[PDB]
Amino acid sequence: RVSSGRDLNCVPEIADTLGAVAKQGFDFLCMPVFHPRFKREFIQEPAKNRPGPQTRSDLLLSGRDWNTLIVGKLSPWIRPDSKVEKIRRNSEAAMLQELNFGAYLGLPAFLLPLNQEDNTNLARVLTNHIHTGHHSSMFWMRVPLVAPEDLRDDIIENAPTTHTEEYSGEEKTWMWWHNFRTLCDYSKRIAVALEIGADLPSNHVIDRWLGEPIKAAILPTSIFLTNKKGFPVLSKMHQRLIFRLLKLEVQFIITGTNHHSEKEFCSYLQYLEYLSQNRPPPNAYELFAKGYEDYLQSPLQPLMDNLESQTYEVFEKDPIKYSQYQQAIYKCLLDRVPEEEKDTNVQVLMVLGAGRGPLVNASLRAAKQADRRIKLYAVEKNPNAVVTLENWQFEEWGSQVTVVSSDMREWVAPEKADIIVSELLGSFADNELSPECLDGAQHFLKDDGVSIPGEYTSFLAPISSSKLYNEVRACREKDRDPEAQFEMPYVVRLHNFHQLSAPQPCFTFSHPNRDPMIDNNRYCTLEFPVEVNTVLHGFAGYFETVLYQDITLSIRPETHSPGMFSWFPILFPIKQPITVREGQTICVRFWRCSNSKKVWYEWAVTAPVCSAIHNPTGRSYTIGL
Amino acid sequence: LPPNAPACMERQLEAARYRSDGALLLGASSLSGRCWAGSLWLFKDPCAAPNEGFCSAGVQTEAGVADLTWVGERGILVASDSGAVELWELDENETLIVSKFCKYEHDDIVSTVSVLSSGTQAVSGSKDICIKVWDLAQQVVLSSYRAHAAQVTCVAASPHKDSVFLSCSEDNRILLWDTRCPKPASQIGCSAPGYLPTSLAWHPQQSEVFVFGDENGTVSLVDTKSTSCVLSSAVHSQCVTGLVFSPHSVPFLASLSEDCSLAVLDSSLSELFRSQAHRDFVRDATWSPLNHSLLTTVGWDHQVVHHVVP
Numbered sequence: 001r002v003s004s005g006r007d008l009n010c011v012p013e014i015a016d017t018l019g020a021v022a023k024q025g026f027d028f029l030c031m032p033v034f035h036p037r038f039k040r041e042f043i044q045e046p047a048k049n050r051p052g053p054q055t056r057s058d059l060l061l062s063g064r065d066w067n068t069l070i071v072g073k074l075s076p077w078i079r080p081d082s083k084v085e086k087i088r089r090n091s092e093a094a095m096l097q098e099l100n101f102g103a104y105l106g107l108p109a110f111l112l113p114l115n116q117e118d119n120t121n122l123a124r125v126l127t128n129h130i131h132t133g134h135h136s137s138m139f140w141m142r143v144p145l146v147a148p149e150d151l152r153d154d155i156i157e158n159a160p161t162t163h164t165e166e167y168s169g170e171e172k173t174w175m176w177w178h179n180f181r182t183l184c185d186y187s188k189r190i191a192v193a194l195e196i197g198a199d200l201p202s203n204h205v206i207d208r209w210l211g212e213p214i215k216a217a218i219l220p221t222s223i224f225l226t227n228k229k230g231f232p233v234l235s236k237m238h239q240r241l242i243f244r245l246l247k248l249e250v251q252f253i254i255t256g257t258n259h260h261s262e263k264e265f266c267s268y269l270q271y272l273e274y275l276s277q278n279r280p281p282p283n284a285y286e287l288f289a290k291g292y293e294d295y296l297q298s299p300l301q302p303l304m305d306n307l308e309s310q311t312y313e314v315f316e317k318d319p320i321k322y323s324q325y326q327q328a329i330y331k332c333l334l335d336r337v338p339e340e341e342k343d344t345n346v347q348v349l350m351v352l353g354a355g356r357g358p359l360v361n362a363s364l365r366a367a368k369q370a371d372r373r374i375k376l377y378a379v380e381k382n383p384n385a386v387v388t389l390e391n392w393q394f395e396e397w398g399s400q401v402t403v404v405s406s407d408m409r410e411w412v413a414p415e416k417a418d419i420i421v422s423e424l425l426g427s428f429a430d431n432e433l434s435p436e437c438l439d440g441a442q443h444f445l446k447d448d449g450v451s452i453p454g455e456y457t458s459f460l461a462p463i464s465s466s467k468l469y470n471e472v473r474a475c476r477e478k479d480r481d482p483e484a485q486f487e488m489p490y491v492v493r494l495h496n497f498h499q500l501s502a503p504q505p506c507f508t509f510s511h512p513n514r515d516p517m518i519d520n521n522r523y524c525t526l527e528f529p530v531e532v533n534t535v536l537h538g539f540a541g542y543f544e545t546v547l548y549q550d551i552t553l554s555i556r557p558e559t560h561s562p563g564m565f566s567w568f569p570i571l572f573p574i575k576q577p578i579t580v581r582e583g584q585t586i587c588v589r590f591w592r593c594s595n596s597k598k599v600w601y602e603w604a605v606t607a608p609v610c611s612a613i614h615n616p617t618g619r620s621y622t623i624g625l
Numbered sequence: 626l627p628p629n630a631p632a633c634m635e636r637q638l639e640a641a642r643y644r645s646d647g648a649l650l651l652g653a654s655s656l657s658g659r660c661w662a663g664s665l666w667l668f669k670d671p672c673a674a675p676n677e678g679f680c681s682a683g684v685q686t687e688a689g690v691a692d693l694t695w696v697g698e699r700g701i702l703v704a705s706d707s708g709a710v711e712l713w714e715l716d717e718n719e720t721l722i723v724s725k726f727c728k729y730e731h732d733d734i735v736s737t738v739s740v741l742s743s744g745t746q747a748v749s750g751s752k753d754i755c756i757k758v759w760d761l762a763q764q765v766v767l768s769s770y771r772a773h774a775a776q777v778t779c780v781a782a783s784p785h786k787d788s789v790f791l792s793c794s795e796d797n798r799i800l801l802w803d804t805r806c807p808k809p810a811s812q813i814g815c816s817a818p819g820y821l822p823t824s825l826a827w828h829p830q831q832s833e834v835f836v837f838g839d840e841n842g843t844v845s846l847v848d849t850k851s852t853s854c855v856l857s858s859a860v861h862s863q864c865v866t867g868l869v870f871s872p873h874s875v876p877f878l879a880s881l882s883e884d885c886s887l888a889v890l891d892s893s894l895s896e897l898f899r900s901q902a903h904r905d906f907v908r909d910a911t912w913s914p915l916n917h918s919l920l921t922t923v924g925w926d927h928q929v930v931h932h933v934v935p
C-alpha cells in the first residue's frame with residue numbers, strides 16, 4: 001500500500017505530536033526545525049545578540065527517528081529573493097542556519113517553497129549549501145500545480161481574473177521549477193513535492209510534470225469532497241491524478257486541518273489506501289520488470305561477447321515470443337511441402353544463433369504440429385552454450401539435430417537450407433548486427449529459401465525525462481571522454497518520462513537481401529511534430545519484426561506484443577537538453593555506419609536548434625563484428 | 626499566583642492590550658526550547674507585569690499566540706499557530722480564564738485577528754492566504770475569502786462600519802473590503818507597486834483615512850476617498866510590525882518595529898518620541914485609558930516598558 005506523511009506548521013511538543021501522527025497511521029512528519037514565527041537578526045544590534053537557545057534540542061528524538069521520521073521545512077519568513085537588501089541578507093544567513101541544522105540532525109529530506117517566479121538567490125544559497133561539507137539529505141521543492149495567483153477567488157472588483165485562454169500563462173509553475181533546477185545544474189539531491197489545489201489545471205500542464213523527479217505529492221484537506229455518510233473523498237479528476245502518481249511511486253503528504261470534523265484524520269489517509277488497493281493490479285509485464293524502472297544497462301553484444309547462462313535463462317523464460325516463432329515455422333512448413341509430399345519431403349531448417357536451443361525446440365514443436373519432416377542444424381559460436389546444445393542433443397534430440405559450433409559467417413554447410421531461423425534482434429532491431437550475421441549466412445540458404453524473421457524495422461520517438469538525463473550524467477567515468485556517457489545507447493525500462501511525439505520508423509532490413517551491392521549503412525531524417533512545451537533529453541528506440549506473413553513481434557508501445565518481456569526499449573541520450581515550444585517540429589538525423597571491424601550509430605538534432613553530432617567515428621560506442 | 630495560572634510566563638511577549646478600566650492583557654508564545662506554546666495573562670496591576678506572582682489571572686494555551694484582541698470587557702480573541710481562532714471567556718470574579726470556543730478552520734498559522742465595530746463579529750487572517758469573518762455568538766465562520774496570492778500579514782476592522790476592513794499580504798496588495806458588494810474586495814494603494822505592507826491602523830475619527838507600515842520601515846498616511854498616497858516618512862530602519870493611534874481627540878501614532886525601537890508621531894508623521902529601552906523586537910503597544918500621555922510596549926526581551934510621551 002501507500003507510503004504517506006503528515007505536514008504540520010505547528011508542533012508544541014515534538015514527542016507527543018510524532019506519537020499522534022504515528023497513531024493516525026502516517027510514516028513520517030514534515031515540521032519546522034525552528035519555530036515558524038521566530039524571525040532572527042544576524043547583523044544589526046541589538047536583536048542580533050538575542051539569548052538562545054535558537055530552537056529545541058536534538059536529544060528530543062533518537063538519531064534513528066531524525067534519520068527516518070522527520071522532514072524539515074524552511075521557516076516561511078526566509079525570503080532569499082526579497083527586493084529589500086536587509087531581508088535578503090538575513091534570509092541568506094537564516095536559510096544556511098536551517099539547512100546546516102537539518103544536516104546536523106541527519107534528516108532524510110528538507111522542504112523549500114517554489115511560490116514566485118524569481119528564486120535565483122534561493123538556488124545560489126542551496127547550490128552553495130549542497131557544495132559545503134557532505135550529507136546526502138534530499139531537497140523537496142514545494143511547487144503548486146497551479147500558482148496561488150491563478151487559484152484566487154474572483155472577488156477583487158477592480159482586479160478581475162482574466163477569463164481568456166493563456167496556454168503558457170497556466171504553465172508558469174513548471175518554468176519556476178525548470179529554471180531553479182537548471183540554476184542548480186540538475187543536482188540529483190533536488191526533487192519536486194508537487195502541491196495539488198481544488199481546481200486541477202488542463203491535462204497538458206499535468207503533462208509537463210510527467211518526466212520530472214516527483215518524490216512527493218501534497219494533498220490539502222480542502223480538495224476533498226464529502227460522500228453521503230460523511231467521510232472525505234476526491235473528485236473523479238483528482239482520482240485519475242492519484243492513480244497516475246501511484247504508478248510513479250511518489251510519497252503522499254497530507255497538509256492543513258481536519259475539515260471533516262465527524263471523523264479522525266486516518267479517514268483522509270484511509271481514502272488514499274482505498275484508492276491504492278483499488279487500482280488495476282500489475283499485468284505480467286509490469287510484475288516482471290518491477291525493479292528495472294529507469295535503470296540504465298549497456299546493450300548486450302551477443303556477437304562480440306559470450307552471453308552468461310543466466311542471460312539465456314531469461315531469453316528462454318518468455319513463452320509468448322517462442323509461440324510466435326513456433327506458429328511462423330508451422331505456417332512456413334505448410335506453404336513449402338504440399339500434403340501429397342508430406343512423407344517424401346524433409347525440410348532442412350537451420351537455427352542461426354541457437355543459444356541453449358529454445359528455437360531448436362520450437363522448430364521441433366512446429367513440425368510435430370504441421371506433421372512435416374525436418375532436418376535441424378543448430379549453429380552457435382558461444383562454446384559455453386554449445387556445451388548445453390550437445391548435452392540436449394545426445395540426451396534427447398538425437399541425430400535429427402546437428403550442433404554446429406562456429407560463426408554462421410565462417411561455417412561451410414554440407415547442404416543448403418530451406419528456412420534459416422534467427423533471434424539476433426536487439427532493442428533497436430539491427431543493433432546486435434542481425435543484418436551482417438544473416439548476410440554472411442545467406443549463401444547457404446537455397447535460391448528460394450525463407451528467413452525467419454524476413455523483415456525488422458527500428459522506431460524512434462523523442463522523450464522528456466529530467467530524471468533519465470540525470471541517470472546518464474551520473475555515468476561519467478575516469479580515464480575516458482567526460483561526455484562519453486551521452487554518446488552511447490542504454491537499454492532501460494523507460495518509466496518516469498514523457499513521449500513528446502508518436503514513434504516513426506528509422507531503419508528497415510529484409511532477409512534474404514538479394515540486392516547485388518548489399519550496403520547495411522543508412523541515413524534517416526525524422527521530423528517529430530510536438531504539440532506541447534517541454535525539454536528534449538533523448539530518443540526512445542523500439543522495433544517491430546515480421547517472422548513470417550502476419551506473425552509479428554513488437555516492443556513499439558502501440559502494437560506491443562502482449563505479455564512478451566525479452567526486450568526493454570533502448571535510449572539514445574543527447575549531451576545538452578533542447579527547449580521545444582508547442583507547434584515546433586523536432587528533426588533528428590540517425591546514421592548507421594560501419595568498418596570491416598565495427599558497426600555504430602551517429603545521431604544529431606537539427607531542429608528546432610542543432611545539437612553536436614553524437615558518437616562520430618564510433619569514438620564513444622561501437623558494436624564488434 | 627492564582628489557581629490554574631502557570632508558574633512561568635513564556636519568554637516572547639506578542640500582545641499588550643488595555644481594557645477600558647485600565648487592566649493589562651498579555652499574550653506570550655514560547656518560540657524556542659522543548660515546548661512551543663503560549664499563555665494569556667490579566668494584570669489589574671499594570672506595573673507588576675511581567676511578574677507571574679502579582680497577576681489577577683493566567684492560563685496555558687495548547688499552542689503559541691500570534692495576535693490577540695479584547696472582545697468588549699470579558700472576552701479575549703486569540704490567533705493560534707494551531708490554525709485555530711480561540712475565544713477565552715473571563716470568570717465572574719475574574720480569577721480564572723476559561724476556553725469558550727476553539728475552532729480549527731484555517732490550514733496554517735492564524736497571523737492576525739480584528740473585532741468589527743459591532744463586537745458580535747471578527748475577521749481573521751492566516752498564512753493559508755484565506756481571510757474569514759466569524760460570528761462570535763454562533764461560534765462558526767460566516768464567510769471565507771481567498772482574495773490574496775500570499776500569506777496575510779494584517780487585517781484591521783473599520784472603527785464604525787461592521788462590513789468594512791483593510792487587509793494586506795506579502796502579495797504586495799492592500800485590500801479595502803466591504804461585505805455588501807458582490808465582489809467584496811477592492812485593491813487600493815500607491816501609484817507604483819512599492820515595498821510589502823506589514824501593518825494597518827485606521828484613523829480613529831476621520832473614518833475615510835488609515836496608515837500602513839512597510840517591511841522597509843516606512844509608515845504611510847493614505848486617503849481611500851482621495852485614494853492617492855498624500856504623506857509618508859522613513860520612521861524605522863527595519864520592518865514596521867505595529868501602528869497604534871492614541872486615544873486623544875487629536876491623536877498620536879505609536880510605531881513599533883523589528884529595529885527594537887518605538888516611535889510616536891503627530892498627524893503629519895514627524896517624530897515626537899523614540900525609545901531604545903527594548904533590546905529585542907517590539908511586538909505591541911496600547912495607550913493607558915487612565916493616563917492619555919502614558920504608553921505601554923512589550924518586546925521579545927520579556928520587558929514590559931511604560932513610557933511618558935510628551
Ligand SMILES: Cc1cncc(NC(=O)C(=O)N2CCCC[C@@H]2c2cccn2C)c1
Nearest residue numbers: 297300315423425426427491565566567568
Ligand atoms: C532474444 C534477445 C536478444 N537480444 C537481446 C534481448 N534482450 C535484451 O537485450 C534486454 O533488453 N535485456 C537483456 C540484458 C539485460 C537487460 C534487458 C532485460 C533485463 C531483464 C529483462 N530484459 C529484457 C533478447
Ligand SMILES: CSC[C@H]1O[C@@H](n2cnc3c(N)ncnc32)[C@H](O)[C@@H]1O
Nearest residue numbers: 302303353355380381382407408437
Ligand atoms: C541473443 S541470442 C543471440 C545468439 O546468437 C549467437 N550468435 C550471434 N552471432 C552469431 C554468429 N555470427 N554465428 C553464430 N552464432 C551467433 C550468440 O552467441 C547468441 O547465442
Ligand SMILES: [Cl-]
Nearest residue numbers: 296297298475
Ligand atoms: Cl551502464
